[PDB]
Structure 1
């Protein structure tokens, strides 16, 4: 007939799933949801390939059936629910809290995290709609609509967003020296300060992001996620702290162990 595609082939699966070529013909195909399949990750992968709590899809399903895994604090029983960049996972029985982050490679790690910090999540606004009764609503990368957002919030900036209640805490403008994480090409794990934004007329607004080794790298503004003010990040970053080393340096590090 011809409509949408329900299946995903295991080689056509996006690399940072890190699936096998063997070990299956297909991949899980993230449900539609709050994240873009190419930059998400289904819950199945998390449960089975990352934490390794499950050996199989079946086990994951079973786990889900006990209403014990929460993603952003409300439960999910959909095995192929997409988790995505910043989202806190609360596996209830272990009393583990994870937050998904990026590695210095493209790969999702589940970070491990405290009760206290778990209660919020960072969310970058994308669009800021006006709706009926001249009320503004931000729309986050979490595919979530924040209504009655504080007026000073502008199109690219992140927002520290509470989970227990839908309301926001604080917001961090997209400034010239704002601690930033990346979430797309090459420099994906990378975490920097920002030197400069280009602001091209018709095109993508390219930005340059100085690291803490002072290695500058550029990136589209699209795929940059504000994470702090110049001093401190508002989230716990992984062990590497977004310092994508050179290849040689990495090898040296590996050797020294």
Structure 2
């Protein structure tokens, strides 16, 4: 037959998964869920190859059996569960909270997060639908459906979704001064203020983003994520703060120690 493929070859795995060639012939195919396979990482990899808590898949299963790891404050027990771009995974045993982010290089890194920030996740809206009764519902990057959004929320906006109540608290627009983070581009993981946008009739829309050091980089509209206004980010960025350094000064300031 020709049904859905259910295996993932090790070399065919996404690059940011960052697995070794000789470490077996297969990679864990993420179960279908809230995030795309390419745009996410299974929690098996998250806490075997990143947190190093478990050194085999079986120990990953042993961890997951105890309802101790919660993705967005709800217990998850699927080994190949897609965690996705930004969300709060809380481990109760060590009482630690990680918000998943990108880095300037473009891999998925857990970021240590305090309790007050761990109940406060960001969701980039992707679609605005209206169902029966003229009730509007937002489809977010998280694969989440939020009914009864404010009318002022637009298609590309980003809402602060509270983890417990699942309700939006406030939304951020996509003006030319809005802080943004690139999610899949050549400049994945970069953070900037959106210098400008341009609308292409019937084709991809490009936006040019200004860095902290006045560095302009362009990207497609489909893979940007508003993370705040001009004032400041609404989350805590990793140690590079989303500032991608050039290949020269990166070596230069790595050398000095």
TM-score range, shorter chain: over 0.9
SS in 1 for 2:12: coil
Give how far 1:120 is off: 1.1
Give how far 1:100 is off: 0.1
SS in 2 for 1:53: coil
SS in 2 for 1:222: helix
Give how far 1:76 is off: 0.6
CA displacement, residues 137-173 of structure 1 (integer Å, 9 cap, x when unaligned): 0000000001001110000111110001111111000
Give the structure 2 partner of residue 197 of structure 1: 197
Give how far 1:186 is off: 1.5
Give how far 1:253 is off: 1.1
CA displacement, residues 59-93 of structure 1 (integer Å, 9 cap, x when unaligned): 01000000110001111100000001011000110
2:67 & 2:45 partners in 1: Cα distance?
Answer: 18
Deviating beyond 4 angstroms after TM superposition, the runs of 4 or more aligned structure 1 residues are none
CA displacement, residues 176-219 of structure 1 (integer Å, 9 cap, x when unaligned): 11000110121011000011101100001100000001110000
Question: RMSD value over aligned CA atoms?
Answer: 0.5
TM-score, normalised with respect to structure 1: 0.99
1:106 & 1:25 partners in 2: Cα distance?
Answer: 24
Give how far 1:108 is off: 0.6
Give how far 1:244 is off: 0.3
CA displacement, residues 216-246 of structure 1 (integer Å, 9 cap, x when unaligned): 0000010000001011100000010000000
SS in 1 for 2:249: helix
Gap regions ≥5 residues in structure 1: none
1:59 & 1:253 partners in 2: Cα distance?
Answer: 38
CA displacement, residues 14-60 of structure 1 (integer Å, 9 cap, x when unaligned): 00000011011100011000001111000100010000000011001
CA displacement, residues 102-151 of structure 1 (integer Å, 9 cap, x when unaligned): 01011111000000011010000000000111000000000000100111
1:159 & 1:182 partners in 2: Cα distance?
Answer: 17
1:251 & 1:127 partners in 2: Cα distance?
Answer: 42
1:172 & 1:50 partners in 2: Cα distance?
Answer: 31
1:29 & 1:213 partners in 2: Cα distance?
Answer: 39
